[PDB]
């Protein structure tokens, strides 16, 4: 079995430099081209180059022409993508593939890397604040929650009560801003009959900064 | 009736069994002598397909070329893997010679006449001979040498314009001579002299040609993107010694935009240097050979072809860039038993 | 966005479903992916088949037109389907499988807290929840009229009880909120627009 293993997630700042590494095993490195590419999630793929690890031979997209290079170690079996003056607009998942044997259709591409998470933002590494989503009282239910706002990097965890309460919870996805933090909001959807005598509390933890918040949302006097 | 087949083709070879030079050497054991009255017979109305791009000749003259190095070309250090193979490594004797691929009983080959032919699909005028024409196994990258050239017009070959995974051969109408020399300090400085008048000229008429298969959009040359010296450079061997030499000054759009232009005539000076560490195109590793020779080494070879890779994605374009070198080894064999195939006979 | 294909398409649990690729320069590929997961080749050279692919999906093309059909759905099908020419991809198709019933989405607008205004900041935060099919677009409004600055919406999560829920801004200083007579959130599904607003008078 043939197999593209990537290096980690990098994150670099604007106008740095970075190397993503595809370790090959499974099959004779020099056979075959490695080609680049990259996906926003949720987008289409984006081809950057190939390599033939033979004698390095490199064919770039125009697009990251004198931004970008190719190299490989022939023994150690690994492809190296090298991209330099970085930029918001690199941010993506980056995969090395490589095509199905023997067809000599040199694009069918069979073999893929997990894919290699950059992360191109100015930010400094920074602690969330946390804010109330105050509810208000319907003799049904009603939604509270937290804002964990403007942090870096990710990810931050939520919890409510200690984990004590789990349904009606939803943690969200983070979005980072324009500014280059992220933000996310947790929700719980609670009884209108427990405001007032029952305490919600969320917990929130962010590793990178060693911040850990612990907040509770009372409901608005109104 | 006969049909497509594979099978292990015999070589022949006028090798003088006498002489020490290695490429005598290897055929002298390896290959028989030439046929000196060689019938070959039109077939009338016949029309046949041959695919340069799939002919298994190819692979085995890759496999005795490759033989015949190995047997003949002893570094004093082989490197590969974790290895290190240390061998006896006198300086040898090397030019290359005519070797011709034949076919056994039972088999033939078929021998494309049309003096347009690309390299694919159907063919008009055919032969059949027992043996191709004396292919000299000159090993180079960007730049064929001592080939055989085009008949009528330059001739672009590729197995698919379209796919820039695939080399692109341009066939050369006409032949450009280029004239190295490592003087008799610096042991490893050479250069490379090329009526510069000429090769623009060519040059121009190859962007022309490629006008053709690429819609007239604008045709721009650059040097490599990157990759090992030997195919960033023109890579050759000459007397034994290797030869790396920079053709940046080969693709100089400057000249070739046609622009009444000065210098563009004029001979060209390309800087090469003799090396003794190289990287192989025969398998995997680098070996290591002793320092060049005393004496002016002087190589005058001949230009008939040359090999490009074409620039991949983005378009938005207006144009079309291509980078010299491309494929491996065996496309300079291609380049040559394009017109040949093999069939059986039954 | 050099082969085009749709951005999202739907079908029903045990029905065949065709996806498709056009504008192709040669022969395509298709190749399936699961979110924040490798891609895995799928058909190759216009209509055939890897030998360990499920025999439910199917190539066809005819000149550039390219087309996927895979028979039979199941919940396990629903991914990004991608296709190549070449170096040209398209832009991938999120393909749904309708697993259960439409479910439209609560909502719940709330003001900037009194803890964000006391420090200069503001934000006005829409939650959507327990919707089905996971596709929403939100819309702000101050007071009758739209805004786009400031505004910033995460896509679609999938909720523990698989239905999904999705989370909208907006950044206002209190300047901005303590002016205007009320913000307003509009969130469409299915053709059906919920609306959820708040003033500063607070309720
Ligand atoms: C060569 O000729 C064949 C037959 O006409 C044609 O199909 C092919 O496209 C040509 N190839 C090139 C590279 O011009
Ligand atoms: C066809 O093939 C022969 C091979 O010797 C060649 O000499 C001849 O000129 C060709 N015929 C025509 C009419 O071109
Ligand atoms: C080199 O080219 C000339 C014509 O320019 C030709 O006559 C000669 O035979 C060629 N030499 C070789 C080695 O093929
Ligand atoms: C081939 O070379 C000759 C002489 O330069 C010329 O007549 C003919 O046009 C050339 N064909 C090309 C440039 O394609
Ligand atoms: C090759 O180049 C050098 C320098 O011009 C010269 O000494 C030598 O005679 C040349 N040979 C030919 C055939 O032009
Ligand atoms: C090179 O060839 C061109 C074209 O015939 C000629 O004008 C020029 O004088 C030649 N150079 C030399 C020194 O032979
Ligand atoms: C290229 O230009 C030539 C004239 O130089 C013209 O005859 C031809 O139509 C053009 N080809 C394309 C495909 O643009
Ligand atoms: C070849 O020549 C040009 C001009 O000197 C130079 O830019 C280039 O670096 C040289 N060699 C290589 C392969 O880089
Ligand atoms: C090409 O031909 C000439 C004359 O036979 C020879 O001296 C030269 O070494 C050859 N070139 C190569 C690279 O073998
Ligand atoms: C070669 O290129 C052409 C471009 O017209 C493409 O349509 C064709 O599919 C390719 N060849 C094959 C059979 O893959
Ligand atoms: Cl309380």
Redesign the interface.
């Known amino acids: 079995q043939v197999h593209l293993m990537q290096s980690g997630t990098e994150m670099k700042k604007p106008g740095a430099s970075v190397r993503v590494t595809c370790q090959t095993s499974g099959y004779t490195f020099?056979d075959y081209?490695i080609h680049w590419?990259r996906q926003v999630?949720?987008?289409?793929?984006?081809?950057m180059?190939?390599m033939?690890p033979?004698?390095?031979?490199?064919?770039?997209?125009?697009?990251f022409?004198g931004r970008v290079?190719?190299?490989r170690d022939?023994?150690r079996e690994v492809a190296y993508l090298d991209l330099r003056s970085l930029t918001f607009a690199d941010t993506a998942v980056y995969?090395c593939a490589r095509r199905?044997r023997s067809?000599?259709?040199?694009?069918?591409?069979?073999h893929?890397?997990?894919?290699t998470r950059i992360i191109v933002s100015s930010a400094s590494t920074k602690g969330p604040?946390v804010?109330?989503?105050?509810p208000?009282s319907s003799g049904g239910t009603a939604?509270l929650?937290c804002?964990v706002?403007d942090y870096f990097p990710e990810p931050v965890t939520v919890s409510w009560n200690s984990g004590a309460l789990?349904?009606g919870?939803?943690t969200?996805?983070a979005?980072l801003?324009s500014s280059g933090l992220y933000?996310?909001?947790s929700?719980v959807?609670v009884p209108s009959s427990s405001l007032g005598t029952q305490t919600y509390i969320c917990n929130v933890n962010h590793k990178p900064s060693n911040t850990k918040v612990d907040k509770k949302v009372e409901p608005?006097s109104? | 009736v006969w049909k497509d087949a594979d099978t292990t083709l015999f070589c022949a070879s006028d090798a003088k069994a006498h002489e020490t030079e290695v490429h005598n050497v290897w055929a002298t054991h390896a290959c028989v002598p030439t046929d000196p009255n060689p019938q070959e017979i039109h077939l009338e109305n016949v029309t046949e397909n041959f695919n340069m791009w799939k002919n298994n000749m190819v692979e085995q003259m890759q496999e005795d070329v490759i033989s015949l190095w190995d047997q003949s070309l002893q570094p004093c250090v082989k490197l590969t893997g974790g290895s290190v193979i240390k061998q006896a490594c006198p300086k040898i004797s090397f030019d290359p010679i005519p070797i011709h691929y034949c076919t056994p009983a039972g088999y033939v080959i078929l021998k494309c006449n049309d003096k347009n032919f690309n390299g694919t699909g159907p063919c008009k005028n055919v032969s059949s001979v027992q043996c191709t024409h004396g292919i000299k196994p000159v090993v180079s990258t960007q730049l064929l040498l001592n080939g055989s050239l085009a008949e009528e017009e330059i001739i672009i070959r590729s197995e698919n314009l379209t796919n820039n995974a695939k080399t692109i051969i341009v066939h050369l109408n006409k032949s450009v001579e280029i004239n190295c020399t490592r003087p008799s300090g610096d042991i490893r400085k050479a250069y490379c002299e090329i009526n510069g008048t000429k090769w623009n000229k060519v040059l121009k008429q190859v962007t022309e040609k490629l006008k053709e298969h690429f819609n007239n959009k604008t045709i721009i040359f650059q040097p490599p993107s990157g990759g090992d010296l030997e195919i960033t450079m023109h890579h050759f061997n000459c007397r034994g010694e290797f030869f790396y030499c920079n053709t940046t000054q080969l693709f100089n759009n400057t000249c070739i935009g046609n622009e009444t232009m000065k210098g563009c005539n004029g001979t060209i000076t390309l800087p090469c240097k003799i090396k003794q560490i190289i990287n192989m195109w025969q398998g995997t590793g680098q070996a290591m050979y002793a320092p060049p020779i005393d004496g002016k080494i002087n190589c005058v070879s001949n230009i008939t072809g040359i090999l490009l890779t074409r620039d991949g994605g983005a378009n938005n374009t207006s144009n079309e860039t291509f980078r010299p070198g491309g494929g491996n080894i065996k496309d300079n064999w291609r380049s040559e038993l394009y017109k040949y195939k093999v069939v059986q006979i039954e | 966005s050099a082969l085009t294909q749709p951005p999202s398409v739907s079908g029903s649990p045990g029905q065949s479903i065709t996806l498709s690729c056009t504008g192709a320069s040669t022969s395509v590929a298709w190749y399936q992916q699961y979110a924040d997961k490798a891609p895995r080749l799928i058909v190759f050279d216009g209509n055939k088949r890897p030998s360990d692919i499920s025999s439910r999906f199917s190539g066809s093309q005819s000149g550039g037109t390219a087309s996927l059909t895979i028979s039979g759905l199941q919940s396990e099908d629903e991914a990004y389907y991608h296709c190549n020419a070449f170096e040209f991809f398209g832009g991938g198709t999120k393909l749904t499988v309708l697993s259960q019933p439409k479910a439209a989405p609560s909502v719940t607008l709330f003001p900037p807290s009194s803890e964000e205004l006391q420090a200069n900041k503001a934000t006005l935060v829409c939650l959507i929840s327990d919707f089905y099919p996971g596709a929403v677009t939100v819309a702000w409004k101050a007071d009758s009229s739209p805004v786009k600055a400031g505004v910033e919406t995460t896509t679609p999560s999938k909720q523990s009880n698989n239905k999904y829920a999705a989370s909208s801004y907006l950044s206002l200083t209190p300047e901005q909120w303590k002016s205007h007579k009320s913000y307003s959130c509009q969130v469409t599904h299915e053709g059906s627009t919920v609306e959820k607003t708040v003033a500063p008078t607070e309720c």
């Open positions: 020099s081209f590419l999630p949720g987008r289409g793929f984006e081809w180059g190939w033939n033979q004698w390095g031979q490199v064919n770039y997209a125009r697009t022409q290079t190719m190299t022939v023994y995969f199905m067809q000599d259709r040199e694009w069918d591409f069979q893929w890397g997990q894919g604040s804010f109330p989503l105050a208000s939604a929650g804002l706002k789990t349904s919870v939803h969200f996805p979005v801003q933000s996310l909001s929700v959807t608005k109104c």
